[PDB]
Ligand binder design. Structure first.
Ligand code: FBP
Ligand code: FBP
Lengths: 87, 275, 275, 87
């Protein structure tokens, strides 16, 4: 249901590479949430991901809970390494 | 009744900074299928107000607004608006209108204070057009507080302005070294003047950071296109863009605004213009 | 019937070059009271065609269009348009659609040839995405002709590409010095890669122009923000902008087009990246 | 009726500083024309001024012929030095 990462992107999770990871979450129909430093807001929301300010080398957890978790937690991994964010 | 087209008034998109912001806007206004109608104002208080009329008239669901100086009057007119308006990378002391920015005064402090820590005596400041509320009322203070808070002479001559042009950034370095008591560290109000400060200071035969250390702002890409690489206070322009529109989307599609007065995170990117 | 709003499809306005052009547009579309509706395409052939539909649909008196590669198909679809369309800083081999540009192949030659004159043996070339007609079909040729016209080995390994990013401009300088026969002069397809070329070449411990001499393109402002100051082939972006819209104004208000296929003047600005 | 200059503007007559000198010619009602290198086109037209390509240190002549020549040839001088073009 969840998959934790480590961001090695000099940019962190901002600009388009972030708008991308949020646009690739409004696709699925489950419930995805991002958790940084123990703070949790809807990973499917811009102001939520843009409010956090995920720098570089910051471990983050993608939590999916719905009728298509595995599918979500899977493509998001692609979306991450396809954007060069975390690993 | 609506038009699916939000308006945006920017000063000049031929500027890395403003264009970088315009892109955040776009991308999100796109994401929510809203057309944008961009128009520059060249920081002309008259053209600014006028542009706001023309745009409001041509029926626009919302308006994004950027200015170096939101006049006391702008607030009157932008209150009498018929549609949601949110300010981007522009500030006004009353908070009657939404606004996404960075915590300026804080970052200005955090940076100057980073140099005190580094062990510096005479810290200088090279800002832009002092008449702009974001500058004199926010960034300058930060620089002063960071100092007065460590007991250091707040010297009115150590703050020297200029326009936001790379050229100016060089003259300031000269007028600054003209001092009997030369600075050993310079805080610059913005990335491109910071580049001029490096060079100008290098031509005189000084080294960075070896002699004077420098720290910029905005963390634009010019931050990496120098030698040494500029240490800059991070301001996420595209993010200010994105979030500025998104909040407008909420206000326009009537969702629920947690806070209409936003202020995204900020940090420093230590490269080599400061050891 | 009209809407007083011309549409513009640009790849990414967070780019000095494209934004610099967007400003020319604006200013003139303003001068003739036409609203603009800007939208990026991120050089995506699909999004490009799609954007053209959406914009045409929402009834727009005209359309400005910019792409690194106008596909053979784009011409089909941009012919079936219902309104004036003029291309800006983008080219397509048939001239069925208006287009304001610079005489590329010429300037590419004029510059390489300026180095032959200077007395150079091995001239290299660092361009961008070869798949773009403006590059391989125009700038590269110029570089070759300038050479073949003076009887010099047209070496396929002396031309090394990269994206238009400052970072790339550095790697090319490395891959170029990796050669047994090192270049003594480098022509770069564009200002920002040219900055990366200076630095990258300096880190290796070489001097500019002392060792290898460099020459850029676009004459953007980064041309002055380096040490030494980049010598660049002048391309008037804002002008390409301005004139691109103005010609559209003529085509739209039905004046009389002397020529729909334009090509404004060009020159070289000799600074210090070349002695 | 005419006033010749010498341009010392690093930019020459391009971009906004040019769009300005053309916007400050559509005001008057006489007939103004610019002449560079013996080429003449309507100084009140963008493609005309943008087609010439006036570099730096290029002598140019502003010719005004109408019911308000002096007024035109006068304000244009202001428009020139107010934009930092020629002298
Ligand atoms: O990073 P740069 O090119 O120095 O630009 C920053 C300056 O431009 C600004 O947008 C101000 O612009 P204006 O002078 O047009 O209002 C700020 O980012 C700062 O005042
Ligand atoms: O001066 P810079 O920043 O190197 O930019 C120039 C590059 O950008 C361009 O607009 C091409 O952009 P695209 O890659 O987005 O099509 C040209 O000017 C050149 O291909």
């Amino acid at each position: 249901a969840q998959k934790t990462f480590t961001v090695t992107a000099d940019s962190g999770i901002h600009a388009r590479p972030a708008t991308t990871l949020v646009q690739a979450a409004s696709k699925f129909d489950s419930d995805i949430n991002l958790e940084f430093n123990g703070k949790t807001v809807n990973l499917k929301s811009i102001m939520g991901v843009m409010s956090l300010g995920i720098q570089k080398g910051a471990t983050i957890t993608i939590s999916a809970e719905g009728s298509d978790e595995a599918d979500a937690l899977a493509a998001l991994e692609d979306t991450m390494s396809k954007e060069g964010l975390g690993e | 009744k609506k038009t699916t087209t939000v308006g945006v008034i920017i000063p000049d998109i031929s500027n890395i900074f403003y264009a970088e912001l315009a892109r955040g806007i776009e991308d999100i206004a796109t994401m929510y299928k809203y057309n944008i109608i961009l128009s520059n104002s060249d920081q002309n208080q008259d053209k600014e107000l006028h542009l706001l009329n023309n745009m409001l008239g041509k029926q626009v669901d919302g308006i994004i607004f950027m200015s170096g100086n939101v006049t006391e009057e702008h607030v009157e007119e932008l209150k009498k608006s018929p549609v949601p308006v949110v300010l981007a990378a522009s500030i006004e002391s009353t908070n009657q209108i939404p606004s996404v920015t960075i915590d300026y005064e804080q970052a200005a402090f955090d940076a100057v204070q980073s140099l005190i820590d580094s062990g510096h005596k005479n810290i200088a400041f090279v800002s832009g057009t002092l008449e702009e509320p974001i500058n004199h009322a926010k960034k300058v203070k930060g620089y002063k507080r960071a100092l007065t808070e460590s007991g250091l002479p707040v010297r009115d001559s150590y703050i020297v302005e200029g326009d936001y042009t790379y050229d100016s950034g060089i003259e300031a370095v000269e007028k600054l070294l003209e001092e009997d008591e030369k600075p050993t560290a310079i805080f610059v109000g913005t990335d491109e003047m910071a580049l001029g400060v490096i060079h100008g200071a290098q031509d005189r035969g000084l080294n960075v950071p070896n002699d004077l250390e420098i720290i910029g702002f905005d963390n634009t890409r010019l931050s990496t296109m120098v030698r040494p690489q500029l240490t800059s206070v991070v301001q996420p322009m595209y993010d200010i863009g994105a979030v500025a529109m998104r909040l407008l989307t909420k206000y326009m599609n009537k969702e629920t605004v947690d806070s209409s007065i936003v202020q995204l995170p900020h940090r420093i990117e230590f490269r080599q213009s400061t050891k």
